Each structure stands twice: as structure tokens, then as C-alpha cells.
Amino acid sequence: STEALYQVGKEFTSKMDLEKPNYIVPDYMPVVYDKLPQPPSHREAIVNSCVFVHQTLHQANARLAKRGGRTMAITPRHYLDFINHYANLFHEKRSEL
Amino acid sequence: ERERWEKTSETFKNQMSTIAGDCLLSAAFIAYAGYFDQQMRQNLFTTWS
């Protein structure tokens, strides 16, 4: 579920330093995880973006299947691969920079 | 060379806050956009942006 994806993203992201005090909360705030803590900080916003990306892939499968092309399933393994890539890229780029 | 290095310092201070979103987009692209063609990859990247 979106809630389970949210907890997975939060638990995997919490191991890396990403908190910034200077964040401006948008008025619209497109929410994907219901019962999200309002107002959200940076970590809540990025985990919401992560679950949005996962659900965007899930919707793109349906969009392609309406046309009738070949589709491959997106899975919790896809989500874990994405979060692992995010953590690795974040750490690598910050250290290099 | 310091004509480049001096402005590179302010660019450092600029993307110090911008690393997170770029890494998020790059990780999403690498993890998800492998199977799709160019148009669908661009559509997914535009939606994430």
C-alpha cells in the first residue's frame, strides 16, 4: 500500500542526513500518502515524491496496456531498488562534491 | 584558473541544497525507465519533474 511504501521510504531514508531547516511548504502540497503529517518537513516531502514515482510507474503500466503494448510489472523490489539507488547516489554525489 | 574556481565555490553553495532532487530524479530514472522507449522515458521524467 501507499502507507507501506511510505514507511519503507522513511525507514530507509532516515539513515542519511537530509534534514534542512529552510524548507517552504507549498500551499497545494500534492499528497500521495493519506494521513501525512501536516505541515511536512523535507523528509516527508521526498518520501511522498518517492511513493508518487512508484504509483506513476503503476499508472504508466495501465496507460500502456490501454494502447495494447507489452508491459512489465513494477514491484516492491522495484521500489527497494529505487530507494537503494537514491541513497547511493545521494551519498556519492555529496562526498564527491 | 581562479576565475573559474571562485565562481565554482558559489556553485557549490548553490547545489548544496539541490543535490537531493537531482539524485531523486536520477535514481527514479535508473530504477524504472529501463524497459520503456525514449518517449515514455521522457514522459516519466517530465511527470516526476
From Swiss-Prot, chain B:
Which region is the signal sequence?
none
Determine the domain of life of the protein's source: Eukaryota
Annotated compartments: Cytoplasm, Cytoskeleton
What are the transmembrane regions? none
Q: What does this protein do?
A: Cytoplasmic dynein 1 acts as a motor for the intracellular retrograde motility of vesicles and organelles along microtubules. Dynein has ATPase activity; the force-producing power stroke is thought to occur on release of ADP. Plays a role in mitotic spindle assembly and metaphase plate congression.
UniProt domain comment: Dynein heavy chains probably consist of an N-terminal stem (which binds cargo and interacts with other dynein components), and the head or motor domain. The motor contains six tandemly-linked AAA domains in the head, which form a ring. A stalk-like structure (formed by two of the coiled coil domains) protrudes between AAA 4 and AAA 5 and terminates in a microtubule-binding site. A seventh domain may also contribute to this ring; it is not clear whether the N-terminus or the C-terminus forms this extra domain.
Family indicated by similarity: Belongs to the dynein heavy chain family.
According to the record's subunit comment, the protein's assembly and interactions are: Homodimer. The cytoplasmic dynein 1 complex consists of two catalytic heavy chains (HCs) and a number of non-catalytic subunits presented by intermediate chains (ICs), light intermediate chains (LICs) and light chains (LCs); the composition seems to vary in respect to the IC, LIC and LC composition. The heavy chain homodimer serves as a scaffold for the probable homodimeric assembly of the respective non-catalytic subunits. The ICs and LICs bind directly to the HC dimer and dynein LCs assemble on the IC dimer. Interacts with DYNC1LI1; DYNC1LI1 and DYNC1LI2 bind mutually exclusive to DYNC1H1.
Q: Which disease is it linked to?
A: Charcot-Marie-Tooth disease, axonal, type 2O: An axonal form of Charcot-Marie-Tooth disease, a disorder of the peripheral nervous system, characterized by progressive weakness and atrophy, initially of the peroneal muscles and later of the distal muscles of the arms. Charcot-Marie-Tooth disease is classified in two main groups on the basis of electrophysiologic properties and histopathology: primary peripheral demyelinating neuropathies (designated CMT1 when they are dominantly inherited) and primary peripheral axonal neuropathies (CMT2). Cortical dysplasia, complex, with other brain malformations 13: An autosomal dominant disorder characterized by global developmental delay with impaired intellectual development. Some patients show signs of peripheral neuropathy, such as abnormal gait and hyporeflexia. CDCBM13 is associated with variable neuronal migration defects resulting in cortical malformations.
Q: What is this protein called?
A: Cytoplasmic dynein 1 heavy chain 1
In its UniProt entry, the species of origin is given as: Homo sapiens
Mind giving the lineage of the organism this protein is from?
A: Eukaryota, Metazoa, Chordata, Craniata, Vertebrata
